[PDB]
Amino acid sequence: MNIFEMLRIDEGLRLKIYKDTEGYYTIGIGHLLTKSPDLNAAKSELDKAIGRNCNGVITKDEAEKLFNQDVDAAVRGILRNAKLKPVYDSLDAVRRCAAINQVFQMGETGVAGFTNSLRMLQQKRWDEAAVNLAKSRWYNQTPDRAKRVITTFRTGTWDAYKN
Ligand SMILES: CCCc1ccccc1O
Numbered sequence: 001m002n003i004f005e006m007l008r009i010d011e012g013l014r015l016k017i018y019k020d021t022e023g024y025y026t027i028g029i030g031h032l033l034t035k036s037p038d039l040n041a042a043k044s045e046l047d048k049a050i051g052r053n054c055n056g057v058i059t060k061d062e063a064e065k066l067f068n069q070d071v072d073a074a075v076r077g078i079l080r081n082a083k084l085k086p087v088y089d090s091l092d093a094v095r096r097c098a099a100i101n102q103v104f105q106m107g108e109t110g111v112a113g114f115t116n117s118l119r120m121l122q123q124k125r126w127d128e129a130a131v132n133l134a135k136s137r138w139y140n141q142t143p144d145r146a147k148r149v150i151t152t153f154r155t156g157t158w159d160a161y162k163n
Helices: 003-011 039-050 060-080 085-090 093-106 115-122 126-134 137-141 143-155
Strands: 014-019 025-028 031-034
Touching: 003 060, 003 093, 003 143, 014 039, 025 039, 025 060, 031 039, 031 060, 039 060, 060 085, 060 093, 085 093, 085 115, 093 137, 093 143, 115 126, 126 137, 126 143, 137 143
Parallel strands: none
Antiparallel strands: 014 025, 025 031
């Protein structure tokens, strides 16, 4: 297991524009196109992203390309973030994948806020961190996924994905 395989399990692969768990237009491997309810605004974002007129459909290769960029951006975002970087840098590599997954799904606004969970993770109070993480809209909206990512944080193992 690695972060791509992890996110690919969590995000799926769809080649046609679809609405994600939040109702937002998305393609590929959880590549969010827009929060606009306008399908055309999503289609314009898709075409901008891919550099061609996709008419709401892309290839597997184009999906993996966006995905590569999205993962890379998630990491680079964490490393740019004063609240996140010290925590992420304190983690072993399996728990770092958990962090990337969370930021991929939620965005770095979305989690830089998780102050208590961040402190606990930094402290390596894994069971406590895991309890705190689940106390969230995140967990309640996507519990099956959040359970897997929390287990990754709690154990620093790939047990929740292995599978
Ligand atoms: C509760 C935050 C878990 C986390 C730690 C470090 C970087 C990104 C993360 O989402």
